[PDB]
C-alpha cells in the first residue's frame, strides 16, 4: 500500500523584499474591524502578488498572513495601521508571515 508523505501544514517565514520605485508589488487585506479576508481572522493578509515583482522574487505568496514588519507587530491592527506600516517600511521590508498548505 501507499503511505502519506511528509506534509508541511504550516510555516512561519521571514522574507526580505526590495522595494522598487513602483513599490512592493502586493495587496493586503483585512484588519481589526474589517471584513476578514479568511474566515473570522481579522488579521492582515497578502491578497495579491505581482508576478516577478519584488515580493514575488522574495518568496511571498498569495494568502500569507502578515504578522510583523521590520520589528512592528500587527496583531490586532486595523487595515490602515498595516497600510501605514508598509508605506513607511522603507527600502528593505522584512516581514514575518504565516502560511498554510493547499
Amino acid at each position: 500500500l501507499l503511505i502519506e508523505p511528509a506534509r508541511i501544514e504550516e510555516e512561519e517565514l521571514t522574507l526580505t523584499i526590495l522595494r522598487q520605485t513602483g513599490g512592493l508589488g502586493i495587496s493586503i487585506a483585512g484588519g481589526k474591524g474589517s471584513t476578514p479576508y479568511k474566515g473570522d481572522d481579522e488579521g492582515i493578509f497578502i491578497s495579491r502578488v505581482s508576478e516577478e515583482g519584488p515580493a514575488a522574487r522574495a518568496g511571498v505568496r498569495v494568502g500569507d498572513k502578515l504578522l510583523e514588519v521590520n520589528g512592528v507587530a500587527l496583531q490586532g491592527a486595523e487595515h490602515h495601521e498595516a497600510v501605514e506600516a508598509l508605506r513607511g517600511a522603507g527600502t528593505a521590508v522584512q516581514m514575518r508571515v504565516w502560511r498554510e498548505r493547499m
Binding site: 512592493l24 495587496s27 487585506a29 491578497s47 495579491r48 508598509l86
Partner: peptide, 8 residues
C-alpha cells in the same frame, strides 16, 4: 468595512 485590495 471590506478592505481587501490596498495596493503597495
Amino acid at each position: 468595512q471590506e478592505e481587501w485590495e490596498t495596493v503597495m
